[PDB]
Design an enzyme around this catalytic site. Structure first.
Site, PDB file in Angstrom:
ATOM      1  N   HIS A 167      -2.641  -9.506   9.820  1.00  0.00           N
ATOM      2  CA  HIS A 167      -3.140  -8.272   9.239  1.00  0.00           C
ATOM      3  C   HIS A 167      -3.993  -8.646   8.021  1.00  0.00           C
ATOM      4  CE1 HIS A 167      -2.089  -4.224   7.142  1.00  0.00           C
ATOM      5  NE2 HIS A 167      -3.148  -4.091   7.922  1.00  0.00           N
ATOM      6  N   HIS A 180     -14.073  -4.289  11.723  1.00  0.00           N
ATOM      7  CA  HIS A 180     -13.826  -2.914  12.128  1.00  0.00           C
ATOM      8  C   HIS A 180     -15.127  -2.187  12.456  1.00  0.00           C
ATOM      9  CE1 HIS A 180      -9.562  -2.465  10.224  1.00  0.00           C
ATOM     10  NE2 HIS A 180      -9.778  -3.699  10.645  1.00  0.00           N
ATOM     11  N   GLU A 187      -8.065 -10.952  10.842  1.00  0.00           N
ATOM     12  CA  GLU A 187      -8.699  -9.677  10.538  1.00  0.00           C
ATOM     13  C   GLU A 187      -9.482  -9.761   9.223  1.00  0.00           C
ATOM     14  OE1 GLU A 187      -5.887  -6.463  10.053  1.00  0.00           O
ATOM     15  OE2 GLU A 187      -7.454  -4.945  10.305  1.00  0.00           O
ATOM     16  N   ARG A 205     -13.090  -4.749  16.372  1.00  0.00           N
ATOM     17  CA  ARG A 205     -12.110  -3.750  16.712  1.00  0.00           C
ATOM     18  C   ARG A 205     -12.914  -2.478  16.827  1.00  0.00           C
ATOM     19  NH1 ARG A 205      -7.517  -1.145  12.928  1.00  0.00           N
ATOM     20  NH2 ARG A 205      -9.298   0.141  12.261  1.00  0.00           N
ATOM     21  N   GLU A 220       2.177  -5.823  11.856  1.00  0.00           N
ATOM     22  CA  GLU A 220       1.704  -5.629  10.490  1.00  0.00           C
ATOM     23  C   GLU A 220       2.747  -4.915   9.643  1.00  0.00           C
ATOM     24  OE1 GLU A 220      -1.669  -3.256  11.582  1.00  0.00           O
ATOM     25  OE2 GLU A 220      -1.140  -1.757  10.077  1.00  0.00           O
ATOM     26  N   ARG A 245       1.330 -10.171  13.964  1.00  0.00           N
ATOM     27  CA  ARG A 245       0.370  -9.645  12.985  1.00  0.00           C
ATOM     28  C   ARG A 245       0.868  -9.634  11.540  1.00  0.00           C
ATOM     29  NH1 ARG A 245      -4.212  -8.104  12.686  1.00  0.00           N
ATOM     30  NH2 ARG A 245      -3.942  -5.878  12.230  1.00  0.00           N
ATOM     31  N   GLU A 277      -3.079  -3.219  20.006  1.00  0.00           N
ATOM     32  CA  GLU A 277      -2.225  -3.472  18.853  1.00  0.00           C
ATOM     33  C   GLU A 277      -1.308  -2.289  18.528  1.00  0.00           C
ATOM     34  OE1 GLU A 277      -3.219  -3.698  14.025  1.00  0.00           O
ATOM     35  OE2 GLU A 277      -4.711  -4.280  15.509  1.00  0.00           O
ATOM     36  N   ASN A 312       0.799  -1.215   0.000  1.00  0.00           N
ATOM     37  CA  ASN A 312       0.000   0.000   0.000  1.00  0.00           C
ATOM     38  C   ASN A 312       0.836   1.272   0.000  1.00  0.00           C
ATOM     39  OD1 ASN A 312      -2.446   1.327  -0.105  1.00  0.00           O
ATOM     40  ND2 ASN A 312      -2.974   0.996   2.058  1.00  0.00           N
ATOM     41  N   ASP A 358      -6.143  -3.622   1.666  1.00  0.00           N
ATOM     42  CA  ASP A 358      -4.940  -3.458   0.840  1.00  0.00           C
ATOM     43  C   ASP A 358      -4.098  -4.729   0.690  1.00  0.00           C
ATOM     44  OD1 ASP A 358      -4.600  -2.021   3.575  1.00  0.00           O
ATOM     45  OD2 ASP A 358      -2.522  -2.508   3.056  1.00  0.00           O
ATOM     46  N   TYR A 363      -6.747   7.809  13.961  1.00  0.00           N
ATOM     47  CA  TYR A 363      -6.667   6.575  13.192  1.00  0.00           C
ATOM     48  C   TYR A 363      -7.978   5.791  13.213  1.00  0.00           C
ATOM     49  CZ  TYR A 363      -6.042   1.843  11.807  1.00  0.00           C
ATOM     50  OH  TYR A 363      -6.209   0.623  11.192  1.00  0.00           O
ATOM     51  N   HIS A 404      -2.022   2.023  16.827  1.00  0.00           N
ATOM     52  CA  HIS A 404      -1.478   2.516  15.562  1.00  0.00           C
ATOM     53  C   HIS A 404      -0.225   3.393  15.714  1.00  0.00           C
ATOM     54  CE1 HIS A 404      -1.992   3.123  11.153  1.00  0.00           C
ATOM     55  NE2 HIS A 404      -2.629   1.973  11.277  1.00  0.00           N
ATOM     56  N   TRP A 420       2.013   7.779  11.962  1.00  0.00           N
ATOM     57  CA  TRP A 420       0.609   7.606  11.607  1.00  0.00           C
ATOM     58  C   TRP A 420       0.160   6.192  11.937  1.00  0.00           C
ATOM     59  CZ3 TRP A 420      -1.600   4.268   7.949  1.00  0.00           C
ATOM     60  CH2 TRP A 420      -3.001   4.378   7.859  1.00  0.00           C
ATOM     61  N   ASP A 469      -6.646  -0.757  18.101  1.00  0.00           N
ATOM     62  CA  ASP A 469      -5.388  -0.511  17.420  1.00  0.00           C
ATOM     63  C   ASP A 469      -4.876   0.865  17.837  1.00  0.00           C
ATOM     64  OD1 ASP A 469      -3.264  -0.283  15.587  1.00  0.00           O
ATOM     65  OD2 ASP A 469      -4.458  -1.103  13.933  1.00  0.00           O
TER      66      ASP A 469
HETATM   67  O1  LIG Z   1      -4.952  -3.039  11.473  1.00  0.00           O
HETATM   68  C1  LIG Z   1      -4.995  -2.654  10.321  1.00  0.00           C
HETATM   69  O2  LIG Z   1      -5.972  -3.082   9.499  1.00  0.00           O
HETATM   70  C2  LIG Z   1      -3.945  -1.703   9.785  1.00  0.00           C
HETATM   71  O3  LIG Z   1      -3.483  -0.791  10.797  1.00  0.00           O
HETATM   72  C3  LIG Z   1      -4.459  -0.916   8.575  1.00  0.00           C
HETATM   73  O4  LIG Z   1      -5.437   0.054   8.978  1.00  0.00           O
HETATM   74  C4  LIG Z   1      -3.274  -0.172   7.963  1.00  0.00           C
HETATM   75  O5  LIG Z   1      -3.371   1.185   8.384  1.00  0.00           O
HETATM   76  C5  LIG Z   1      -3.343  -0.232   6.440  1.00  0.00           C
HETATM   77  O6  LIG Z   1      -3.568  -1.581   6.031  1.00  0.00           O
HETATM   78  C6  LIG Z   1      -2.020   0.248   5.852  1.00  0.00           C
HETATM   79  O7  LIG Z   1      -1.986  -0.118   4.471  1.00  0.00           O
HETATM   80 MG   LIG Z   2      -3.254  -2.120  12.595  1.00  0.00          MG
END
Ligand SMILES: O=C(O)[C@H](O)[C@@H](O)[C@H](O)[C@H](O)CO
Ligand SMILES: [Mg+2]
Ligand SMILES: O=C(O)[C@H](O)[C@@H](O)[C@H](O)[C@H](O)CO
Ligand SMILES: [Mg+2]
Lengths: 397, 397
Positions: free
Chosen positions: B307, B122, B334, B147, B257, B278, B231, B37, B311, B159, B207, B397, B205
């Site tokens: 993960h 989600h 997920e 989540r 991830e 992950r 996470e 991604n 994407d 996020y 993040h 981020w 998450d």
């Molecule tokens: O837990 C998740 O699903 C991940 O944090 C995604 O939200 C990523 O931000 C994204 O896949 C980046 O490409």
């Molecule tokens: Mg994540």
């Protein structure tokens, strides 16, 4: 001030180089090396499609912000393609900043710590005798330091013996025997000392082929010959791989040309498992990141030994020489001369004399690129070799 | 037997995917996900220009040798671009192997360890109330696990709250306050437990936005709510970053991830600093590598939590479900549903029922690509956002 344009140039004046150019609204520009041997078009695409469009309109003076923006912003952090892209931008921005400051790069970094920059040359031959001849000629050339590699009897091909590693479109297939190499290699260093004495610095590159206890054995075996370093003993994704070697030998150890992040070597350094860190500017995230690696290294008496092969362009070399000139804990600078065609594509003001580099005095890192000349040499695919054991096992090249 | 052809396909049926197809001399083929991604074309180039040419003529059945050949042979090891390319090849070769064996992939790996694969959905909202509405809705769809993310009062953007992260040609710019988030987040979980009770699995998450002691604080604060996991608390290039969190809280932790190598997490696992790993198939070097990671995790009671965002293509998801069906130490999978256009471009035989996946029974990983349809959706550049603190600091981020 702001970035007006940014683009890559791909050229093959003897071998492939990828260069990033950044042009400001004021017309000042900077360049950075982006060459990743055998994977060049991956970096070119990373830059062209993903980084370059984000650079437009950014304040070129924001070096640190741009580094973090690209490093953190990529989301997927570290890696050779990733960090080479980041390094190219960083080198280009430092180039711009030094030009803006009207200073050679080494002045911007904190001024010179040394009057010249010691190098080593590659000495190679099929037999030990062949190698010794090469040592002789380079010593006559004024080199104070030489890397020595020679063929291993019973092995068709060994590392560093014929030399342009990426000499085939597809990977060449070499064959390897660790046991034959371990028995032979010490004879090379004994011969070098017998002929050339103790004053000469002698380096050797193991090039990833040993296990740790094998490298410990080798380090011990070569103690009497007092090597400047034994390089890349063992693959080191697992940094603990160095521990057994360090616990068993006093031969100094060098590693890291395949690294791209301080996170690849933080423990190697903090646990005092190496004497020289080899990660260079174009693969190690540029000036911004390497200053931090060199500084961490200095806390543990570790010195810089920048990887300096033909597959890093004169852009990297000029920048490296500036860095080498300032950094307190400088160790040595590797030198593999570029082709005339390469030198002409990348006009530069660093100088080589009597075995040493002298940093340029022009503002910037002192290297430029002649784009029209670059355009005369289209890309030619060339891959690094792979190495297999005698049973066919895919090993470490 | 031998590979006769290999090529990538790039398509954007709702968002960008890159796929590798490998075809043998007997006309059998396999495909692998190569999607990274926000850096998609770097992997495309890595494959097209450097990997694909070396695949031709190789024995398709030599999965292990091909993996090592690409991994070691690249010389520059690890990294997101590198390991995604390798994963794509690996997935396609496992696809071919399974087809050759006339078995669905999970059979090849050791057979089925479970009858279905639990997922989480989600659930997100501007306010806690908004989020709670989404939880109710997903519980109605049969999800046993959710989540939960919700906006932070006083912060424009957080996020996982409006959802497709890569929603801009160039990186969107978000603003962040750790302190406001830390005070707010526990209220979300408290509300989820108040309305929905104890039986629901609740994930969150972080993040990457906290320091270790901040995440320790958060973990402790949310202990009463018994989260399934917290996470990506902190950036983890320095794996020691997890130590203070683990020493201060019993809230289960998940990470990985953004990893691509066992060497990104070996210490996290061996020191028991995490409960779920992950890293997914397409970024973690494929089935070959992820089997080793999962097996390492198993020694330390660590479970898989792949993960599974939009994407990663249905190719990864199908292969992942097969993997999830076999792996003993499965944790959770997920699920972010792909668009109808994406599902059409990638016909597949895995099924979603009552909050769980059921693995396909067709030979291979059960996914294919409709290349004619893929051609109707050209690539469209889309970048992940960056995150800055209130003072402008480029953050995580
Ligand atoms: O837990 C998740 O699903 C991940 O944090 C995604 O939200 C990523 O931000 C994204 O896949 C980046 O490409
Ligand atoms: Mg994540
Ligand atoms: O010490 C060295 O100079 C290195 O080992 C080089 O010989 C590499 O093999 C080459 O630069 C890879 O592209
Ligand atoms: Mg070397």
């Amino acid at each position: 001030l702001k970035i007006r344009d940014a683009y890559t140039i791909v050229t093959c004046p003897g071998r492939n180089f990828v260069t990033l150019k950044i042009v400001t609204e004021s017309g000042t520009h900077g360049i950075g090396d982006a060459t990743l041997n055998g994977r060049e078009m991956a970096v070119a695409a990373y830059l062209d499609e993903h980084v370059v469009p984000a650079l437009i309109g950014r304040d070129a003076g924001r070096i640190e912000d741009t580094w973090q923006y690209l490093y953190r912003g990529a989301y997927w952090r570290r890696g050779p393609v990733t960090m080479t892209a980041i390094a190219a931008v960083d080198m280009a921005l430092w180039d711009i900043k030094a030009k803006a400051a009207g200073m050679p790069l080494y002045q911007l970094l904190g001024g010179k710590s040394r009057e010249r920059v010691m190098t080593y040359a590659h000495c190679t031959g099929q037999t030990i005798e062949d190698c010794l001849g090469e040592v002789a000629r380079h010593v006559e050339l004024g080199y104070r330091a030489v890397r020595v590699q020679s063929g291993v009897p019973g092995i068709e091909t060994t590392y560093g013996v014929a030399y342009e590693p990426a000499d085939s479109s597809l990977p060449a297939e070499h064959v390897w025997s660790t046991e034959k190499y371990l028995n032979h290699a010490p004879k090379l260093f004994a011969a070098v000392r017998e002929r050339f004495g103790d004053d000469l610095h002698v380096l050797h590159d193991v090039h990833h082929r040993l296990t740790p206890i094998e490298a410990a054995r080798l380090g011990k075996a070569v103690e009497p010959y007092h090597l400047f370093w034994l390089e890349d003993c063992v693959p080191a994704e697992n940094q603990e791989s160095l521990r057994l070697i360090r616990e068993h030998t006093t031969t100094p150890l060098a590693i890291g040309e395949v690294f791209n992040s301080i996170h690849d070597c933080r423990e190697l350094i903090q646990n005092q498992w190496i004497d020289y860190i080899r990660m260079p500017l174009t693969h190690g995230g540029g000036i911004t990141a390497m200053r931090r690696v060199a500084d961490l290294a200095s806390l543990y008496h570790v010195r810089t030994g920048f990887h300096g092969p033909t597959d890093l362009s004169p852009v990297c070399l000029g920048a490296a020489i500036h860095f080498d000139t300032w950094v307190p804990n400088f160790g040595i600078q590797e030198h593999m001369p570029h082709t005339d065609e390469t030198d002409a594509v990348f006009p530069h003001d660093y100088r080589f004399e009597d075995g040493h580099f002298l940093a340029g005095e022009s503002p910037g890192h002192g290297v430029d690129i002649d784009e029209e000349l670059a355009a005369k040499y289209p890309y030619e695919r060339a891959s690094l070799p792979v190495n297999r054991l005698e049973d066919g096992t895919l090993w470490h090249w």
